[PDB]
Amino acid sequence: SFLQRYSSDPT
């Protein structure tokens, strides 16, 4: 349903 996908820029 909700699951890990894309994460905000670390750079």
Partner 1 sequence: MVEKCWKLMDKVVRLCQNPKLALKNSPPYILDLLPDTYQHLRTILSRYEGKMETLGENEYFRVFMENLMKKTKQTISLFKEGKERMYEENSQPRRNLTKLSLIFSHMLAELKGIFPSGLFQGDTFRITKADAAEFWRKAFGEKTIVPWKSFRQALHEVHPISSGLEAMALKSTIDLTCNDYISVFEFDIFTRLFQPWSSLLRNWNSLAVTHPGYMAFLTYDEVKARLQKFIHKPGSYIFRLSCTRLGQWAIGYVTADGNILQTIPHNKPLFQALIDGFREGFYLFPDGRNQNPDLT
Per-residue interface string for the shown chain with partner 1, residues 1-11, x marking contact by CB under 8 A: --x-xxxxxxx
| Buried residues in 1-11 as b, exposed as e (16+ CB within 10 A) | eeeeeeeeeee
Side-chain-facing half-sphere of 11: CA atoms under 13 Å: 0
Question: Cβ 1 to partner 1, closest distance in Å?
Answer: 10
Question: Cβ 2 to partner 1, closest distance in Å?
Answer: 12
Structure tokens at 5: 């996908």
Question: Cβ 3 to partner 1, closest distance in Å?
Answer: 8
Binding site for partner 1 (CB under 8 A): 3, 5-11
